[PDB]
Amino acid sequence: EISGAAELDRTEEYALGVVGVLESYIGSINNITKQSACVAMSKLLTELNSDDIKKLRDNEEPNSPKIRVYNTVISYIESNRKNNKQTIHLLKRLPADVLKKTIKNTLDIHKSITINNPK
Structure with a gap:
Protein backbone atom coordinates (compact mmCIF):
# COMPACT_ATOMS: atom_id res chain seq x y z
CA GLU A 1 0.00 0.00 0.00
CA ILE A 2 1.15 3.56 -0.72
CA SER A 3 -0.06 7.16 -0.94
CA GLY A 4 1.85 9.42 -3.32
CA ALA A 5 -0.04 12.53 -2.22
CA ALA A 6 -3.26 13.51 -3.98
CA LYS A 54 -34.69 0.10 -21.03
CA LYS A 55 -31.18 -1.04 -21.87
CA LEU A 56 -30.40 -2.02 -18.28
CA ARG A 57 -33.81 -3.68 -18.15
CA ASP A 58 -33.26 -5.66 -21.35
CA ASN A 59 -30.49 -7.41 -19.42
CA GLU A 60 -33.39 -9.20 -17.71
CA GLU A 61 -35.95 -11.68 -19.05
CA PRO A 62 -39.05 -10.23 -20.82
CA ASN A 63 -40.98 -11.66 -17.87
CA SER A 64 -38.60 -11.25 -14.94
CA PRO A 65 -39.65 -9.79 -11.54
CA LYS A 66 -37.25 -6.86 -11.88
CA ILE A 67 -39.48 -5.81 -14.78
CA ARG A 68 -41.99 -4.08 -12.49
CA VAL A 69 -39.45 -2.07 -10.49
CA TYR A 70 -37.51 -0.97 -13.57
CA ASN A 71 -40.74 -0.27 -15.45
CA THR A 72 -41.90 1.95 -12.60
CA VAL A 73 -38.82 4.14 -13.06
CA ILE A 74 -40.04 4.88 -16.59
CA SER A 75 -43.20 6.40 -15.12
CA TYR A 76 -41.08 8.88 -13.17
CA ILE A 77 -38.77 9.80 -16.04
CA GLU A 78 -41.54 10.10 -18.62
CA SER A 79 -43.55 12.11 -16.11
CA ASN A 80 -40.72 14.60 -15.59
CA ARG A 81 -40.90 15.47 -19.28
CA LYS A 82 -44.68 15.82 -19.12
CA ASN A 83 -44.67 17.81 -15.88
CA ASN A 84 -42.04 17.98 -13.15
CA LYS A 85 -44.87 19.05 -10.85
CA GLN A 86 -46.39 15.57 -11.01
CA THR A 87 -43.04 14.01 -10.13
CA ILE A 88 -43.01 15.80 -6.78
CA HIS A 89 -46.74 15.25 -6.26
CA LEU A 90 -46.37 11.50 -6.77
CA LEU A 91 -43.84 11.30 -3.93
CA LYS A 92 -46.06 13.55 -1.80
CA ARG A 93 -49.06 11.21 -1.96
CA LEU A 94 -46.78 8.23 -1.32
CA PRO A 95 -45.53 7.49 2.25
CA ALA A 96 -41.94 8.33 3.22
CA ASP A 97 -41.55 4.58 3.72
CA VAL A 98 -42.21 3.78 0.05
CA LEU A 99 -40.55 6.97 -1.02
CA LYS A 100 -37.20 5.84 0.38
CA LYS A 101 -37.49 2.74 -1.79
CA THR A 102 -38.18 4.86 -4.86
CA ILE A 103 -35.11 7.01 -4.21
CA LYS A 104 -32.97 3.90 -3.78
CA ASN A 105 -34.09 2.41 -7.09
CA THR A 106 -33.09 5.74 -8.64
CA LEU A 107 -29.61 5.88 -7.10
CA ASP A 108 -29.16 2.19 -7.91
CA ILE A 109 -29.25 3.14 -11.59
CA HIS A 110 -26.80 6.01 -11.16
CA LYS A 111 -24.29 3.66 -9.54
CA SER A 112 -24.60 1.36 -12.54
CA ILE A 113 -23.36 4.09 -14.89
CA THR A 114 -20.65 5.00 -12.39
CA ILE A 115 -18.04 6.64 -14.63
CA ASN A 116 -14.44 7.57 -13.83
CA ASN A 117 -12.48 5.34 -11.46
CA PRO A 118 -11.31 7.14 -8.27
CA LYS A 119 -9.66 5.30 -5.38
Whole structure:
Protein backbone atom coordinates (compact mmCIF):
# COMPACT_ATOMS: atom_id res chain seq x y z
CA GLU A 1 0.00 0.00 0.00
CA ILE A 2 1.15 3.56 -0.72
CA SER A 3 -0.06 7.16 -0.94
CA GLY A 4 1.85 9.42 -3.32
CA ALA A 5 -0.04 12.53 -2.22
CA ALA A 6 -3.26 13.51 -3.98
CA GLU A 7 -2.99 12.68 -7.68
CA LEU A 8 -5.53 14.38 -9.95
CA ASP A 9 -8.27 14.98 -7.39
CA ARG A 10 -9.85 17.38 -9.88
CA THR A 11 -12.62 18.23 -7.42
CA GLU A 12 -14.77 20.75 -9.27
CA GLU A 13 -17.14 21.48 -6.40
CA TYR A 14 -17.99 18.59 -4.13
CA ALA A 15 -19.78 17.28 -7.22
CA LEU A 16 -22.99 19.24 -6.66
CA GLY A 17 -25.23 18.24 -3.75
CA VAL A 18 -28.32 16.92 -5.54
CA VAL A 19 -27.43 13.38 -4.50
CA GLY A 20 -26.01 14.59 -1.19
CA VAL A 21 -29.45 15.79 -0.09
CA LEU A 22 -31.11 12.46 -0.84
CA GLU A 23 -28.31 10.48 0.82
CA SER A 24 -28.79 12.57 3.96
CA TYR A 25 -32.57 12.14 3.86
CA ILE A 26 -32.62 8.39 3.27
CA GLY A 27 -29.49 8.23 5.41
CA SER A 28 -31.53 9.35 8.41
CA ILE A 29 -28.25 10.93 9.51
CA ASN A 30 -29.85 14.38 9.29
CA ASN A 31 -33.28 16.04 9.07
CA ILE A 32 -33.84 16.80 5.38
CA THR A 33 -37.30 17.96 4.31
CA LYS A 34 -39.17 15.82 1.79
CA GLN A 35 -39.47 18.99 -0.30
CA SER A 36 -35.70 19.35 -0.56
CA ALA A 37 -35.42 15.65 -1.37
CA CYS A 38 -38.05 15.62 -4.12
CA VAL A 39 -36.83 18.78 -5.84
CA ALA A 40 -33.29 17.42 -5.72
CA MET A 41 -34.32 14.09 -7.21
CA SER A 42 -35.83 16.08 -10.09
CA LYS A 43 -32.38 17.34 -11.12
CA LEU A 44 -31.18 13.77 -10.74
CA LEU A 45 -33.47 12.37 -13.44
CA THR A 46 -32.05 14.90 -15.91
CA GLU A 47 -29.13 12.47 -16.05
CA LEU A 48 -31.02 9.17 -16.05
CA ASN A 49 -32.86 8.90 -19.37
CA SER A 50 -35.81 6.56 -19.91
CA ASP A 51 -34.16 4.89 -22.90
CA ASP A 52 -31.17 4.28 -20.63
CA ILE A 53 -33.27 2.22 -18.22
CA LYS A 54 -34.69 0.10 -21.03
CA LYS A 55 -31.18 -1.04 -21.87
CA LEU A 56 -30.40 -2.02 -18.28
CA ARG A 57 -33.81 -3.68 -18.15
CA ASP A 58 -33.26 -5.66 -21.35
CA ASN A 59 -30.49 -7.41 -19.42
CA GLU A 60 -33.39 -9.20 -17.71
CA GLU A 61 -35.95 -11.68 -19.05
CA PRO A 62 -39.05 -10.23 -20.82
CA ASN A 63 -40.98 -11.66 -17.87
CA SER A 64 -38.60 -11.25 -14.94
CA PRO A 65 -39.65 -9.79 -11.54
CA LYS A 66 -37.25 -6.86 -11.88
CA ILE A 67 -39.48 -5.81 -14.78
CA ARG A 68 -41.99 -4.08 -12.49
CA VAL A 69 -39.45 -2.07 -10.49
CA TYR A 70 -37.51 -0.97 -13.57
CA ASN A 71 -40.74 -0.27 -15.45
CA THR A 72 -41.90 1.95 -12.60
CA VAL A 73 -38.82 4.14 -13.06
CA ILE A 74 -40.04 4.88 -16.59
CA SER A 75 -43.20 6.40 -15.12
CA TYR A 76 -41.08 8.88 -13.17
CA ILE A 77 -38.77 9.80 -16.04
CA GLU A 78 -41.54 10.10 -18.62
CA SER A 79 -43.55 12.11 -16.11
CA ASN A 80 -40.72 14.60 -15.59
CA ARG A 81 -40.90 15.47 -19.28
CA LYS A 82 -44.68 15.82 -19.12
CA ASN A 83 -44.67 17.81 -15.88
CA ASN A 84 -42.04 17.98 -13.15
CA LYS A 85 -44.87 19.05 -10.85
CA GLN A 86 -46.39 15.57 -11.01
CA THR A 87 -43.04 14.01 -10.13
CA ILE A 88 -43.01 15.80 -6.78
CA HIS A 89 -46.74 15.25 -6.26
CA LEU A 90 -46.37 11.50 -6.77
CA LEU A 91 -43.84 11.30 -3.93
CA LYS A 92 -46.06 13.55 -1.80
CA ARG A 93 -49.06 11.21 -1.96
CA LEU A 94 -46.78 8.23 -1.32
CA PRO A 95 -45.53 7.49 2.25
CA ALA A 96 -41.94 8.33 3.22
CA ASP A 97 -41.55 4.58 3.72
CA VAL A 98 -42.21 3.78 0.05
CA LEU A 99 -40.55 6.97 -1.02
CA LYS A 100 -37.20 5.84 0.38
CA LYS A 101 -37.49 2.74 -1.79
CA THR A 102 -38.18 4.86 -4.86
CA ILE A 103 -35.11 7.01 -4.21
CA LYS A 104 -32.97 3.90 -3.78
CA ASN A 105 -34.09 2.41 -7.09
CA THR A 106 -33.09 5.74 -8.64
CA LEU A 107 -29.61 5.88 -7.10
CA ASP A 108 -29.16 2.19 -7.91
CA ILE A 109 -29.25 3.14 -11.59
CA HIS A 110 -26.80 6.01 -11.16
CA LYS A 111 -24.29 3.66 -9.54
CA SER A 112 -24.60 1.36 -12.54
CA ILE A 113 -23.36 4.09 -14.89
CA THR A 114 -20.65 5.00 -12.39
CA ILE A 115 -18.04 6.64 -14.63
CA ASN A 116 -14.44 7.57 -13.83
CA ASN A 117 -12.48 5.34 -11.46
CA PRO A 118 -11.31 7.14 -8.27
CA LYS A 119 -9.66 5.30 -5.38
